[PDB]
Amino acid sequence: EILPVSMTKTSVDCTMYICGDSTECSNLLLQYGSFCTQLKRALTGIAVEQDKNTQEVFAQVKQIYKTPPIKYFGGFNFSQILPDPSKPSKRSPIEDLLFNKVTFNGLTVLPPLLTDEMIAQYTSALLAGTITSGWTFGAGPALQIPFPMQMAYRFNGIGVTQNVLYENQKLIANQFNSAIGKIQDSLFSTPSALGKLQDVVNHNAQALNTLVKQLSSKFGAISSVLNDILSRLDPPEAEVQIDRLITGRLQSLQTYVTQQLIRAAEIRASANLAATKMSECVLGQSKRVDFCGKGYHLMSFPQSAPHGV
Amino acid sequence: QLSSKFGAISSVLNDILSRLDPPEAEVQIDRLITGRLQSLQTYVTQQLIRAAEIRASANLAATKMSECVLGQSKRVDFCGKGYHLMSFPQSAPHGVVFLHVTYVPAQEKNFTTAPAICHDGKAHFPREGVFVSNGTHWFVTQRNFYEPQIITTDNTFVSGNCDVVIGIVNNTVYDP
Amino acid sequence: LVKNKCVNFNFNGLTGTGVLTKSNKKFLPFQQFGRDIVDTTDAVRDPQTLEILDITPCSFGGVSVITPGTNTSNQVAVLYQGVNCTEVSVAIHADQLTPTWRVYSTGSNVFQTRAGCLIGAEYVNNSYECDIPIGAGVCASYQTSQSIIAYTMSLGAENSVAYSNNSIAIPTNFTISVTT
Amino acid sequence: LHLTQDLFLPFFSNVTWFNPVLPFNDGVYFASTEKSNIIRGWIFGTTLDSKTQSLLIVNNATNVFIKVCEFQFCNDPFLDVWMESESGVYSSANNCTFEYVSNLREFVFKNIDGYFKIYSKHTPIIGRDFPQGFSALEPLVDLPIGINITRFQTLLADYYVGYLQPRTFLLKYNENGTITDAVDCALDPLSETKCTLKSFTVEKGIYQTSNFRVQPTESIVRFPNVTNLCPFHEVFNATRFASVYAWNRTRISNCVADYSVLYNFAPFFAFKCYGVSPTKLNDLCFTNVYADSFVIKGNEVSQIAPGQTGNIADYNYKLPDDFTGCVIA
Ligand SMILES: *[C@@H]1O[C@H](CO)[C@@H](O[C@@H]2O[C@H](CO)[C@@H](O)[C@H](O)[C@H]2NC(C)=O)[C@H](O)[C@H]1NC(C)=O
Ligand SMILES: *[C@@H]1O[C@H](CO)[C@@H](O[C@@H]2O[C@H](CO)[C@@H](O)[C@H](O)[C@H]2NC(C)=O)[C@H](O)[C@H]1NC(C)=O
Ligand SMILES: *[C@@H]1O[C@H](CO)[C@@H](O)[C@H](O)[C@H]1NC(C)=O
Ligand SMILES: *[C@@H]1O[C@H](CO)[C@@H](O)[C@H](O)[C@H]1NC(C)=O
Ligand SMILES: *[C@@H]1O[C@H](CO)[C@@H](O)[C@H](O)[C@H]1NC(C)=O
Ligand SMILES: *[C@@H]1O[C@H](CO)[C@@H](O)[C@H](O)[C@H]1NC(C)=O
Ligand SMILES: *[C@@H]1O[C@H](CO)[C@@H](O)[C@H](O)[C@H]1NC(C)=O
């Protein structure tokens, strides 16, 4: 299951966008009120909400847990999801495959507060707590327990006694290993798997390209360049043309900001859903039908991804 | 924003009328009207966007009330951090405050475990507990509170013989 | 012709401002200017030396300010966003900046990070919880003598669970908590 | 807390501590700290030659009597141990136009839109050290002088001078109406977040503010390789010329009238350009210029001009009234 968690943070400056390096245009913008300050406020609110979403989704553990020297887990391999200490950035192979499949005038893109490695460390700590302690570390101190006993507890939560797991351990382990192996091939072979994550980036890029493209529009004026209009004719007609251009660019900015607000609200809803799914499927076993997967639920493991989980 | 000229002569209605001909006053009043209409539209759109979020929060609050106050919820980290017990609502200006009562264990203690027990060639499994040992003797206890008990027939159930269990132990299961 | 410096250029009546650097784009012999995907004149050719000459925009960004609170003290730190510390420092030693207050304190103690150039704090090798977020994992705090310091955020303590094939832990006491 | 933008004296500026003629740069700040009353007032004007009314602001006995007049005494001054008069700095007097009657004497003088605003404040401090603290200046009086003043002096028989700049200030109004504190918006980074937040208290955190831009410095101009040139050696250094009746009409081009070579090769005694300036002739180049070959007498060249008459003008070569060209002999 794949879910977006956040989007890129942007900041826009009014003067460098509209009245580019013109002292005759800055004065004519003061008479239009306080649009710029409230636009900046809205953008800053979106920016801080972006980091709040990630912190809410991922930062759910007080302490960072680390797996012991990897040993026999009853037959389960887990090598494709645990971090590999043999390459930079300390990722997992599936994470590496995920990362390798995802590819101005007055605008600015701000970096996220949390780097990718911190997200990887959160994911590793969550996985270690899940596989060494079980569901107990989500409600207090973590308690150690062997993995087969943990799954014996898991079967007991769906109406199946403990006999089945203990008398069929090897077969279940082999089935789990085969499923894990086939997951990587299924993800790699299918090209249109990470679609929704790419859609967010494509939408943001299209919005930015449209915003920078309309800067060349004449908007029913003499031209689309301030210098030529200024040094060609009388002050009054220059004022009229500058007012026309200012109105057009303000309309464009308003449209962009409203679109960004709507998309941010949608992503906020998605992030809340993702946080709930994490807390209810990873830190415990859920009885809700078709919530943590198709069929009776056993476990769940998270993996980091660009702008999503 | 009532004082913004929006590219006009002035921001006062009366002076514009009693200073020049009605024709140009028409254009100036039209400009002011358009500016103020855009301001109102922006205000209404912002209000609607905020109202949607407040509606979502209200729905979440209603669900939390119905599931934590009127009963006990099994969802993890929904009605508090830990094992949920109760909840109490308190009124507040344009909001509500919830007091969540939870259960948190402490004072851990290790020991040695074993999935099953072989007494007379037949594997035994606990009915509701977990097998533990304090080094010398084996007991069965709960899963969230230490309470050892002696192993007995009505405490465990038998399923199969002892040839598939990995960590099986050879202690004694008593019968009444 | 001046390269790698901010100048005003006039090429065959085309006027603008920026930094002229060497490029590798290959025009055709009948082409003079170059344009980006939307409107900007990304490249230009010297009419005399016939050399491709990348016009690159001037550096700009935010001047966000870090303060620990008026009640506590009066010292502040300034973060320049999206610019390396060689420039800005150069543009201080030779002026041509927009913010007229210019020099804050200088006094060395300039740190360079992925967010931008930080002036007014010293980087330390310690690590603990974040207080004032700044950029990519870099936070700031006020400690003592007293000054503003920047460090690398810590995600918390490291705890290793003594996993074993036959080891379990059972609580013997509980606690009742109330949260709001 | 009101945010306003006007001309003010910047905080922590440079102040000169002391009859030199101090320039009047869009208002000045004056603070006199004396009790002997040596500084009897100020004079204002540009030339003091009965063109601009010398503003004689004199505080003679009790309250300042603003008399807009000019009072030539005799000329030669000297030290005196009554009159207390005889300042002959100026020469000419004229008629009177306006008349008005009514330590640490600090005054602010401003002029804008033909109105002279004088703000006064008199705190009877006992001391000579520069006193710290806040003191607001009230609009004592305004005057519709409607003239221009660029220079001012002080009337003698201990004072500081400052100049004002446009700036944005933050002011605090008391629950009376009194101004108690002010904050600048240019000095320090802190007193910019204070202006942005519109408050005197700032909490812990990181605050966005204005943006920085690296302005340009030099102005490079690179025009294309210059290759073509005006053919003139064949004209202005020829072998033979023609008679007046069989004049040539040589066609020339590639001509920016860029003739500096002729300045050095031929020391032109006569050079008359009846159109645009010869220096500006390099600004625009031409296409269909024609040139003529004449060999005429000495007292005949003056006849080759627009609107002239004579034998040569009437029978050989005639020039138009709107004749745009240069004659060289
Ligand atoms: C867990 O899976 C990994 C990869 O699926 C196993 O590593 C492979 O081991 C075989 C040994 O037969 C090698 O031929 C492969 O080259 C290994 N893969 C890689 C990528 O190096 C690993 O052995 C499995 N764990 C256990 C305990 O068997
Ligand atoms: C005008 O034309 C004459 C004839 O070509 C030039 O005369 C020559 O000047 C050079 C100067 O070094 C002498 O060496 C030659 O001997 C001269 N003439 C001959 C016989 O070749 C004259 O210099 C030209 N000057 C101008 C004003 O262009
Ligand atoms: C273990 O439990 C038994 C139960 O009676 C007790 O007698 C004994 O002291 C305990 N400790 C050890 C080390 O056996
Ligand atoms: C447990 O008991 C069975 C039956 O007496 C015996 O075969 C087996 O070896 C015993 N296991 C151990 C570890 O002694
Ligand atoms: C440092 O600043 C220079 C500015 O000339 C820039 O080219 C460079 O990318 C910056 N970073 C490093 C690591 O040099
Ligand atoms: C008991 O379990 C805890 C789990 O953190 C471990 O730290 C401790 O060393 C264990 N004690 C033993 C194995 O005696
Ligand atoms: C599992 O733990 C037991 C301890 O009783 C140990 O003997 C065995 O080697 C372990 N299995 C491994 C390390 O694969």
Ligand SMILES: *[C@@H]1O[C@H](CO)[C@@H](O)[C@H](O)[C@H]1NC(C)=O
């Ligand atoms: C459990 O905790 C309570 C209070 O936290 C304490 O009074 C008591 O001694 C502890 N131990 C037992 C066995 O109750």
Ligand SMILES: *[C@@H]1O[C@H](CO)[C@@H](O)[C@H](O)[C@H]1NC(C)=O
């Ligand atoms: C206003 O001023 C009077 C003195 O003129 C003073 O008594 C009073 O307390 C002041 N109150 C305010 C600050 O409103």
Ligand SMILES: *[C@@H]1O[C@H](CO)[C@@H](O)[C@H](O)[C@H]1NC(C)=O
């Ligand atoms: C044109 O280029 C040639 C060769 O570099 C040079 O000698 C000549 O002076 C140039 N002419 C100009 C720059 O006008």
Ligand SMILES: *[C@@H]1O[C@H](CO)[C@@H](O)[C@H](O)[C@H]1NC(C)=O
């Ligand atoms: C003038 O025109 C005649 C035409 O035959 C030509 O021979 C002569 O060289 C020309 N000279 C000048 C001064 O233009």
